[PDB]
Structure formats: structure tokens, C-alpha cells
Design a protein around this nucleic acid. Structure first.
Ligand code: ZN
Ligand code: ZN
Ligand code: ZN
Lengths: 103, 110, 95, 82, 97, 92, 103, 97, 82
DNA sequence: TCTGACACGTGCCTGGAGACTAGGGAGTAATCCCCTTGGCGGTTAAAACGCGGGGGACAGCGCGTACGTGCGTTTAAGCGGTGCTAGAGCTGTCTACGACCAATTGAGCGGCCTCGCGACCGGGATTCTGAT
DNA sequence: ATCAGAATCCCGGTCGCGAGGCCGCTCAATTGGTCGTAGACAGCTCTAGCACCGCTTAAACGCACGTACGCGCTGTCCCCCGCGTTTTAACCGCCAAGGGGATTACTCCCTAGTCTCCAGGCACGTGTCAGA
């Protein structure tokens, strides 16, 4: 309860390595994401995100779909969308979300 | 020189406030005067009783794998210790529920 | 314009960090330990006042507090609680 | 504003649930009216004392502390609302 | 069709409701009852929500304790079902006239 | 030396029963009853004075304590027999 | 010129004032507080004494003893309720036999 | 010879002892029991006579009330004799257990 | 020293107490249960009486100490100087 | 008849009463906002009915245990004396202790805001009974 | 006894409101000094617990005997439980008013507090009468 890191998307406490935001203008812990959330949301992994020097947290690029950020955008809550994207052939919900906007 | 003031609870080595307890005793019209060792004793006793109830309630919550005590974890911590149960035998606890207890007569036969 | 009221939540929480360093307490349970403290305080203080009045004394002292704790608290509690208070009092003597 | 026939709102399933929490397994069909009467008497006493405290406070509202004091006067100290 | 033997759901309900903590009486009927009773003693009264909640909590605790005593009185008489005479005996012994 | 309510209870007894005396043991029982009731009512009046943030015990506190302890007809009667004295004190 | 005479009571009022002040129930005691308290005490004592005297008269006795007081309290409903948890020395008990016990 | 049926003398003493008002336990054995019990709290105690008398009055009143409640419990279970289970039930319901 | 004085509460004394209570038949095992109950009650009262006496630094247990000890348990006793 | 427990009589203080005072507790106007009172529409879960039948309350009967009643034996509770002394009351002295009071300073109370916990569903074991 | 309806954890997905902390004041706890008296300690006295001795003699105590009643066994209706169907009012989310709990600013008069004097209960002492 005093040691674990909390992911931005899932907002739970667990023992796992989490990525960091390299944006100098980035503030707070919102640059930290856990593998199970980001791999299900955008197709990125912990290793590549850690190794990339210019990698930014999904809030930094503006592609964060967390409920807090989703509400900051003035639009509704996503909920669970992985299986909907899978039924539509989309590997990640972000491509599904981008396709939904296009349609 | 008036050296830096230290709370009387620190001199007593306590966590409950001896000074506030002194004020409560004096303003609660219990007696015309109150000594210097009355607030210390009363504060220590209240601290100890709270410590025991919290000891029991933390375990009662841990066996429920919860990280935030609720009223329930007090009742299970009270009605299971015989002495604490005796001390608080005429007290109801809001949202406290009751211990699971089914009489052996009602249990299914065979 | 504040209606600020005293409550033992500053201590009921702070003594919880000395007995269960990684366990919380709900605001519905802080308002129960608050009442427990405010009830036991009144019980012991009333008994001490009665004891002082019986002996025609006007000063509530640690003897009346000790006797009240001995009268109300049952069993090992009264044997343990007293042993706490005395320590505090004797520590108070050393300042 | 006035109300009438509200003790029947203490339903038979609600009384059965209160008995189930009390550990009883079988319930006679005649204990529902008995429990309604007992509850009404208990409520009458406590509410009378609480409204007495409220009247002494020169207040038109009944607060939680009045109820807590009314219960404490009957040896039914309540923790959680004080 | 599957049909539980009588009394099975009684123990199931006993376990379920002894596990929980919420109030068993619906809030609106109890609020109406409290207002109806208090209207006699004083008129045009007002209740804090905390007042009604505290009254309800006390009433449920009292009724649960009385039902435990009634169940003990029932078991004493070599019975399983609680009857009004058990409630009467428990209230007479407890001193509640 | 020692004080009691012997004279006053004897006066009340002679008022209510001109031809009835009282025994010493029963007299002590009446003393204990008067002390117990006085303690109860004074303590309850003190509690009401504390609850409402009042530093003075007045006739209202005694009246409400009487209404709180005394049951049924004993309350409504006693209140009527209490205020009747106080208003008399007002007339002096 | 005593305080009882002004209030028209036979119970003391100055003594009740002294017992209210010396018993640290409150810091201040009002003017009419001892008067009201003494009147209520007088009323309760008068009721108890009337009941006990009637019981003694029905007992063919001249002096009131603890048995008469016990009968008077235990027969009057309101006085019994006011004194429900009090024991009277040599007061005895109300003679009562359960119906099933009888032949 | 003349022989009362069982239970007649029972009612006779029931009426005789609810009519009477004196103490029913002998003074000396109760005083000895009081002294022995108090020996375990403070050594070489002394007792005022009124203290032992008050203790006897309180103990007798307590036992008479307990026996009243026990008789009620026994009657509830369709019985005439009082058994230990009735005393246990009365003490449990009264809050003593 | 004093011992086994609880047997001094004889069987006929318990019989008289029960008859005053209003019972007509008594089981044979009632006497031991009553002796145990009386011993527990006596210990509970005497403990507090001796505590009150010790608080006053006295070697004599007065009647008023017993009166206070009985009052503590909600068993107020009249007629002994209370 | 006789037992004394209770009914007054009378000194005698010693707590109560009368005058006067000053200071602080508490009515009273004067808002203010907040948190109690309503309407109002769905809707969903929860109360209400109905019905079959199974387990349980209730009465009866019979045999045997255990308790009440009585009688003769015993034995210690109760009563009355008689010294004896521990200790409970009471008083006097005077000292340590707590109240009252002016600075003054930090501990705790209110608002804030964000982080972690305690919730919801959604498929898969995992028990949990019932009849065979 | 094994298999199948049925209820229930269980562990993955999310989300959402509250609970730890954190900063700013402000109210009260702390320091220090002065002063009055409450309780502690030392003698003195008288009371009333406590220990013993005898002596009746009611009360406890063993045994005997009979029978009342507690207790297990059968029946036998019948009342409550479980489940399916329907329906209906609680619950939730909104808005909409305004009544009154709460908080200052007087300011007035009620009550400790002091002093002086005095008569109402208390204790010692009998004496007629309940009543054991
Ligand atoms: Zn995550
Ligand atoms: Zn970032
Ligand atoms: Zn986000």
C-alpha cells in the first residue's frame, strides 16, 4: 500500500514496472502506465516504451483514453472496449476508436 | 528565558491530549478542583482502551482482506473479546451487523 | 462562522499508526471510536466525581481515577489499564 | 401532511429478515403483529424522549444528538451518530 | 423440477443476513412511521436525516436482540418455531414489562 | 452533625394522615428515597444544562428533567405542582 | 420569612439550594430551581406516603413499616415503574401464585 | 395417619413466606461465608454488623427474584419442577451470561 | 482460614428462598446451581465494597460501602443509610 | 403483662435569611445560507397472492425416576454475659497544591485536491443440496 | 452415491466517490508568579468489632415410603415454506422554495459574593402507648 506504483489508466496498486514520461513539460504521475493497460489499449509494450528516448505517455500525445482524461475532454466514459474491437478486427481500441470517429 | 514549551502529553509520553482532558475535566463540573495526575491517568487509560480496540479491529479487517476499517470490523472486534464485550455490553454500533451464530438445534439433521 | 468542534480523530488516527501501520479507518468508524472515547471518559469521570464526593473531598486526584478504573473496567483490563496510567503519572513526576 | 396507517409498512418480509438476522429458522404466523406492537412501543418511548429534548432546546427540528441522548437515558447507548 | 427441502432456504437466509450489515426495513415506510408517531407529541416537527437514520438503527438492533431472546425461549420449550408466547416471556424476563 | 429529611417527611405524613405515625426503619427508607430522587433529577437537569450550553440550572431544566424521569400521570401532575410554587414565589 | 413559607412548601428550599450548589451539578443555580425541585420532591413524597398510609390502614396498624411501603410502591403502577430496580429492606414481596400451580 | 397430598405443604409455605418479611438464611453461616469470600480480596478485614446485614438482604432479594424468573421459565416449558436449565435461561436472558 | 462455608447455605434455606419466590417443586440439582450463583453474586458485590473501603484507607467495611457497591450494579438498596 | 420504640421538650448552635453590589450570562434584532421540505418521471426490485405438501406442533399413553412428607436423632444457630483492644472519628497546625491571571505560541480545525480502495459486471469453476 | 439443477465464489476487466495528507489561520494550551486553603500528619478518645464460655432447643439431617410427574413414543392434522406470477410502490436523479439553525452585537438584570444577625433542625433526655 506504500510501495506499489499505480497505473494511470487502471488506477490500481500492483507490483510491476511502469513506463515514464520524458516530456519536460509533463507533470505529475500521469506519465506512468502499466503493461496490461497500454498493451490492451494502444498495442505498445513496456520494453519498447522504456527503451525509446522520445517515448511520451499517452496523455502527452493526447491519445489517453482514461476515464479521468476522457471526462476532461467533455465526452463520455469508454468502459470495456477490447472485445468490441476484437469482433471488428481491430488489434487495439485506439485504432478502433480512431475508426469510429472516421465513420 | 522561558524555554520552548512542551506539551504535558509529551512529558507523560502519551498521544491523547492531557491538556484538553484537563480542560474537559475542569469545565465538565465534576469537582471543584482536579489534580495534576488525574488528566494524565485518564488520558493514558483512554489511549490504552483505544489501542486494544484498534488492535482487535485491524485483525478483524485483515481476516476480511480489507485495508480500511469499517464499523463492522469494530463489532467483530468487540463481541469476540469477552472483557471488551463485557465493558460495552449495553452499546449498539451503527452498521455493525451481528456475529454469525446459528443454534445447533436448527442445523439440518442426518 | 466556522463552528469548529473538537474531536479525538487527530489521536484516534495517530494511535492507529502505532498499532497497525498499514491499516486505515473509515469516517463512519472514526465517528464510532470518537463516541467510544467520549463515553468512557464520561463514565470514569463520573465515577471519580462520586468517589471524591463520598469521602468529603473536593479534589479529583489520580487515586479517584485509579479507583474508578478499578470499578468500571472488568478483568485483565482493570489490571492492565491501571498499569498504564500509573506509568504515565510516574513519568509525569520525572517531567 | 398528516399520515395514517404506517405501521403496516413494516412488512412481513422485513420482519422475517430481521428474524433471520436474529438466527430464527421457523416463524409462527402470529409474530408479525406482535413485533409491530413491540416496535411501536419502543419507537414511542424513544421519540417521546427525543422530542422532549428538542422542545427544551426551543427548536422546531429533531437532530441526531437528541435521539442519542434519548437512547442513552434508557441504557441503549448508540455509537456512530454522536 | 428442483425444489429445496423446506428449511434449507431458511438457513441460507440466516447466513446471508447475519453476514451483512445493511438495514432490513425499507427507508420510506420507516420514515413515514417515525413522522406519524412524532406528530402526536409535537406538531409541525422537523427531523434531521441523521435523526431518522439513528432511530432506525436503534430499532433494528433492539428487534434483532429481542429475536435472539425469543429464539432461545423457543428452543427451551423443545420447539423450533418462535411463537408470541416466547416473545412475551423474553420481554417479561428482560424487565421490559 | 448529621442532617436528614426526617422533619419534612414527618410534616408531610402528618398533613396527609393526621393519625398515622412512621417507624425509624421506614423513616430511613423514606430518607433514602428522597435522596435518590433528588440525585436523579439534579443529575438530569445538569445534563440538560450541559447539552444546551447553559451554565445555569433554571426552572426549565428541572421541569424537563421531571418530564424525562417521571412516568405518565406522575409527570403531568408533578409539573402542575411544581410551577404552582414558582409562580407563588413570583407573587411573594 | 423562610424560603419554604414564601413558596408554601413543607420541604426545605434553602437546604435544597445548598445541596444544589455543593453538589457541583452546575456553576449557577437559578432562583426558582430549588423551589421547583422541592415542590416536586414534596409531591412525590406525599403520593408515596398517602399510598403507604392507606395500605397501613387496610392492615389494621398504626405505624408505617417497610412492608407497607413495599406494598404501596409495588401496587401503584407509576410508582412501581419509577422504582423498578430498587430493593426495600425487610420489604417482602407481593404474594402471588401462578395459575398452573393451583390444584 | 393423616398425610397431606404432595404439593399441599408447598403452597402452604409459598403463602407463608410471601406473607412474611424476615431473612430466610441463618445469620451465622451467611456471615462466615461473607468473611471467607472477602478473605480473598483484602487480608484481615473487619465488617460492621449493618454491612453483613445489608449483604444478606441484597443476596436474599436477588435469589428470590431469580427464582421467580426461573419459575416462569419452567412454566413456559410445560413443567412444574424447576431444573438448572431454567436458571441458566433466566440468567442468560437477564444479561448475566 | 475458613473454607467450605458455601455448604452453610443449607438445602432447607434454598428451599425457603425458592418457596418465597413462588416455586412448588424443586429438582435435586437446583441447590448446587443456586449455591454457585449466590457465590458469584456475593463475590461481585464484595469486590466493589472492599474497593470502596480501601479507597478510604479503612480496615472496616461499613454498611455504606456495601450500599455503594450494590448501587454500582443497578441494585439500589434502601434502608441502610443510603 | 410487659417489652421497651416512638412522641415530644428544650438548649444550642450553625446554617439560613436580609441588604447591597458588580459583573457576566443570557434574551433579543438581524441577517444568512443550508438543508429540510416538497413535485416528477421511470424502472426495476421487491412486496403480495396462490398453491402444493412436507416437517413440525400438539395431544395421548405408559413406565419408571425422583421428589415431597413424615419421624426420630443430633447439633450448632441463637442468646446472654465479659473483658479487650483495633481503629474509626475528631481536632489542631501548617505546608504543599491547585486556582486565577497576563503573554504567547503552536497544535488542531477548515478547506482542497488527488490518490488509492472499495465497488459494478462477465464468463468459469466450486461448492451445495436432492433423488436416485 | 453420482449426477445434475442451483446457488455462489473468483478472478479478470473498469469507475468513482471518499480518505489521506497538506497549507493557512486562530484559539487555546503552556509559562510564570502569587496566594489562599484543602488535605496531610500527629495525638487523644471513645466505640464497637471480636474472641471466649455456657446452655437450651429449634432447625437441619438421615432414612422410609409412596406416587406425582418428567420423558420417550406414536399418531395426526395443518400451517408455514419454497417457488412461480404479477404488480406496485421504493429508489434514484433532478429541480424548487424557504424555514429555521447558527452567529454576531448589544445590554439588562440575575445571581455569586460579603457581612451581619438570628431562628430552624439536632441531640440529649425522658414518658405515654403500640403490639409482639
Ligand atoms: Zn493500468
Ligand atoms: Zn506525461
Ligand atoms: Zn488520462
Amino acid at each position: 500500500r506504500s510501495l506499489g506504483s499505480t497505473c494511470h489508466q487502471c488506477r490500481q496498486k500492483t507490483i510491476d514496472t511502469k513506463t515514464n514520461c520524458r516530456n519536460p513539460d509533463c507533470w505529475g504521475v500521469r506519465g506512468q502506465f502499466c503493461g496490461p493497460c497500454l498493451r490492451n489499449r494502444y498495442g505498445e509494450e513496456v520494453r519498447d516504451a522504456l527503451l525509446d528516448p522520445n517515448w511520451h505517455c499517452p496523455p502527452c500525445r493526447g491519445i489517453c483514453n482514461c476515464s479521468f482524461c476522457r471526462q476532461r475532454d467533455g465526452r463520455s466514459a469508454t468502459g470495456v472496449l477490447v472485445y468490441l474491437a476484437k469482433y471488428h478486427g481491430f488489434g487495439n481500441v485506439h485504432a478502433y476508436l480512431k475508426s469510429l470517429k472516421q465513420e | 528565558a522561558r524555554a520552548k514549551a512542551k506539551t504535558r502529553s509529551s512529558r507523560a509520553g502519551l498521544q491523547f491530549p492531557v491538556g484538553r482532558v484537563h480542560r474537559l475535566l475542569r469545565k465538565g463540573n465534576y469537582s471543584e478542583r482536579v489534580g495534576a495526575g488525574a488528566p494524565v491517568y485518564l488520558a493514558a487509560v483512554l489511549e490504552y482502551l483505544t489501542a486494544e480496540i484498534l488492535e482487535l479491529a485491524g485483525n478483524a479487517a485483515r481476516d476480511n482482506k480489507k485495508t480500511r476499517i469499517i464499523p463492522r470490523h469494530l463489532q467483530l472486534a468487540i463481541r469476540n473479546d469477552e472483557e471488551l464485550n463485557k465493558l460495552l455490553g449495553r452499546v449498539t454500533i451503527a452498521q455493525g451487523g451481528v456475529l454469525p451464530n446459528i443454534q445447533a438445534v436448527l442445523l439440518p439433521k442426518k | 462562522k466556522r463552528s469548529r468542534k473538537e474531536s479525538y480523530s487527530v489521536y484516534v488516527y495517530k494511535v492507529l499508526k502505532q498499532v497497525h501501520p498499514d491499516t486505515g479507518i473509515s469516517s463512519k468508524a472514526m465517528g464510532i471510536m470518537n463516541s467510544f472515547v467520549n463515553d468512557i471518559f464520561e463514565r470514569i469521570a463520573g465515577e471519580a466525581s462520586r468517589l471524591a464526593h463520598y469521602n468529603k473531598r473536593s479534589t479529583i486526584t489520580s487515586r479517584e481515577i485509579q479507583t474508578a478504573v478499578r470499578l468500571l473496567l472488568p478483568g485483565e483490563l482493570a489490571k492492565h489499564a491501571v498499569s498504564e496510567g500509573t506509568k504515565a503519572v510516574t513519568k509525569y513526576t520525572s517531567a | 401532511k398528516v399520515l395514517r396507517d404506517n405501521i403496516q409498512g413494516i412488512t412481513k418480509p422485513a420482519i422475517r429478515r430481521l428474524a433471520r438476522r436474529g438466527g430464527v429458522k421457523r416463524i409462527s404466523g402470529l409474530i408479525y403483529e406482535e413485533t409491530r406492537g413491540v416496535l411501536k412501543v419502543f419507537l414511542e418511548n424513544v421519540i417521546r424522549d427525543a422530542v422532549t429534548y428538542t422542545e427544551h432546546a426551543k427548536r422546531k427540528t429533531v437532530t441526531a444528538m437528541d435521539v442519542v441522548y434519548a437512547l442513552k437515558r434508557q441504557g441503549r447507548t448508540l455509537y456512530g451518530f454522536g | 423440477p428442483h425444489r429445496y427441502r423446506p428449511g434449507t432456504v431458511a438457513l441460507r437466509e440466516i447466513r446471508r443476513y447475519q453476514k451483512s450489515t445493511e438495514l432490513l426495513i425499507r427507508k420510506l415506510p420507516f420514515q413515514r412511521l417515525v413522522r406519524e408517531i412524532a406528530q402526536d407529541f409535537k406538531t409541525d416537527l422537523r427531523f434531521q436525516s441523521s435523526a431518522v437514520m439513528a432511530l432506525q438503527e436503534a430499532c433494528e438492533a433492539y428487534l434483532v436482540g429481542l429475536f435472539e431472546d425469543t429464539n432461545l425461549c423457543a428452543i427451551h420449550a423443545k420447539r423450533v418455531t418462535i411463537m408470541p408466547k416466547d416473545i412475551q416471556l423474553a420481554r417479561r424476563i428482560r424487565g421490559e414489562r
